[PDB]
Amino acid sequence: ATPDEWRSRSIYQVLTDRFARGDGSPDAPCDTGARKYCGGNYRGLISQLDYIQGMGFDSVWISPITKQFEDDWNGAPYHGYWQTDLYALNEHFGTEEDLRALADELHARGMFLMVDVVINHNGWPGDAASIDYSQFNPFNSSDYYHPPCEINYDDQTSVEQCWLYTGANALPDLKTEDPHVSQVHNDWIADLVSKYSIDGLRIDTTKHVDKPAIGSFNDAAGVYAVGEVYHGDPAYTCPYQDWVDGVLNFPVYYPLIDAFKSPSGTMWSLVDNINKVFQTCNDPRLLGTFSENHDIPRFASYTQDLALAKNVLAFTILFDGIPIVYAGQEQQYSGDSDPYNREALWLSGFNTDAPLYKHIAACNRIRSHAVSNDDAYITTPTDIKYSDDHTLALVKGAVTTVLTNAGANAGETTVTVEATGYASGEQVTDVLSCESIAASDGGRLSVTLNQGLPRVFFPTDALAGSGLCE
Ligand SMILES: *[C@@H]1O[C@H](CO)[C@@H](O)[C@H](O)[C@H]1NC(C)=O
Numbered sequence: 001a002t003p004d005e006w007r008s009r010s011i012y013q014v015l016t017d018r019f020a021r022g023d024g025s026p027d028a029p030c031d032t033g034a035r036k037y038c039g040g041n042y043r044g045l046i047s048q049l050d051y052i053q054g055m056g057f058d059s060v061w062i063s064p065i066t067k068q069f070e071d072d073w074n075g076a077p078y079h080g081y082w083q084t085d086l087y088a089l090n091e092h093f094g095t096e097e098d099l100r101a102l103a104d105e106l107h108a109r110g111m112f113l114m115v116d117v118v119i120n121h122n123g124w125p126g127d128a129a130s131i132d133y134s135q136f137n138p139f140n141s142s143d144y145y146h147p148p149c150e151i152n153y154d155d156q157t158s159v160e161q162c163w164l165y166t167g168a169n170a171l172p173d174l175k176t177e178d179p180h181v182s183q184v185h186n187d188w189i190a191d192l193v194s195k196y197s198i199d200g201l202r203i204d205t206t207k208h209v210d211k212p213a214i215g216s217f218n219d220a221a222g223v224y225a226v227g228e229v230y231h232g233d234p235a236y237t238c239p240y241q242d243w244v245d246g247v248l249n250f251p252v253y254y255p256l257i258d259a260f261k262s263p264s265g266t267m268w269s270l271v272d273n274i275n276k277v278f279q280t281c282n283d284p285r286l287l288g289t290f291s292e293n294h295d296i297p298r299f300a301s302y303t304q305d306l307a308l309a310k311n312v313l314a315f316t317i318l319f320d321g322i323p324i325v326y327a328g329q330e331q332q333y334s335g336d337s338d339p340y341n342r343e344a345l346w347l348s349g350f351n352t353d354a355p356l357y358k359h360i361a362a363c364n365r366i367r368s369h370a371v372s373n374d375d376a377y378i379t380t381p382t383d384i385k386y387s388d389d390h391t392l393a394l395v396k397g398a399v400t401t402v403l404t405n406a407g408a409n410a411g412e413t414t415v416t417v418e419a420t421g422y423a424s425g426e427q428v429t430d431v432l433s434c435e436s437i438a439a440s441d442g443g444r445l446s447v448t449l450n451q452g453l454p455r456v457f458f459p460t461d462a463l464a465g466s467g468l469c470e
Pocket residue numbers: 133134140141
């Protein structure tokens with residue numbers, strides 16, 4: 001699927017091993033500290049797609065699928081980022097039949113499959129010096145790899161040419177810029193995308209790969225790719241969108257978490273980074289918006305406050321870009337680091353009564369109803385119509401999203417949002433509370449916030465067929 005087809009999508013990210021098991025158990029243990037395979041698989045994922053669709057997600061980004069190393073003495077490669085063979089599958093997740101059945105079933109539901117891919121490196125269960133290169137496939141010689149060194153983070157060519165790690169487990173760094181390696185990577189992905197009907201990619205460790213290699217890889221794939229560019233500065237991350245269709249929105253992530261992790265936070269750095277991303281990135285609406293992933297602390301590890309989590313999720317889903325929710329976020333999983341942030345989802349019992357499950361469902365539903373209602377909604381830029389220390393109002397076509405970090409104990413506050421684009425007198429509904437008000441002079445909206453809850457407005461007349469608020 002093209003970048004254009006990906007615009008209205010929203011993504012539920014899973015660690016395959018940690019989402020759902022084929023045998024349907026919601027009680028197989030997953031001691032996150034053990035770093036073993038817990039047993040999640042493709043047939044498990046297929047079995048719980050109603051859970052995923054129930055939240056309004058229409059795409060799934062799964063762990064890398066390639067064969068890993070076998071020796072688990074220093075941890076099992078349950079996360080898929082330690083590959084040895086591009087041409088074979090990790091059979092812990094399933095056979096090619098299982099994976100083909102995943103793609104088929106996603107597609108029967110009108111969903112998209114996004115695959116995580118690593119071209120930066122293979123994995124080895126031992127240090128750099130111990131690596132037997134002949135064991136890798138297809139890059140079965142030291143000739144295809146940069147010499148081992150640790151990265152000097154003040155040097156971009158070191159970021160690209162040194163290794164992510166040289167101790168056990170080592171991450172031998174491929175010569176992605178070598179013509180033969182690039183050729184093989186490109187033929188590989190062109191083939192893999194056809195073979196398994198992949199709709200999009202998520203490219204691991206994109207900043208550690210030279211940009212031209214990224215470009216020809218994305219071209220060869222022939223589908224939308226979002227690059228994981230792990231950097232908070234729009235001046236660094238945004239120029240990557242000249243080479244990949246999208247990047248994950250790390251520049252917005254950092255001030256977002258700073259804003260909403262505590263009522264002590266302020267909106268100003270979020271506003272500033274949003275502006276900067278809009279000034280720097282070719283297309284902010286092809287970026288992946290997230291507030292969690294497997295590398296960073298869970299949101300609920302910063303704060304237990306439900307209203308704060310509702311505000312970050314509202315932003316995550318309703319802001320410009322393609323929303324991404326990390327499996328567990330909706331159950332308020334709280335692991336503060338790797339491996340604790342890879343909790344098994346099945347252990348929550350796939351609880352559709354969780355408040356953040358229902359919250360995500362409503363946010364996704366109004367976003368998708370907005371896409372349905374107006375062809376131009378998805379490509380219309382979000383404007384910041386109001387900001388102060390503790391409040392942000394985002395207007396994207398006819399959707400007005402009003403957020404606050406005042407938290408659950410806030411009491412009551414009133415904010416007046418000027419120039420929303422609603423007509424004076426136009427009745428709008430906050431689809432989260434099903435409470436209804438009207439716009440006033442010049443599109444002015446008088447918004448009262450209570451107990452730190454976000455509000456999401458949509459014109460009341462246009463709400464029919466939504467499933468929202470009767
Ligand atoms: C890698 O594979 C090729 C093709 O079989 C073979 O000729 C070559 O000897 C291998 N290289 C090493 C270092 O084993």
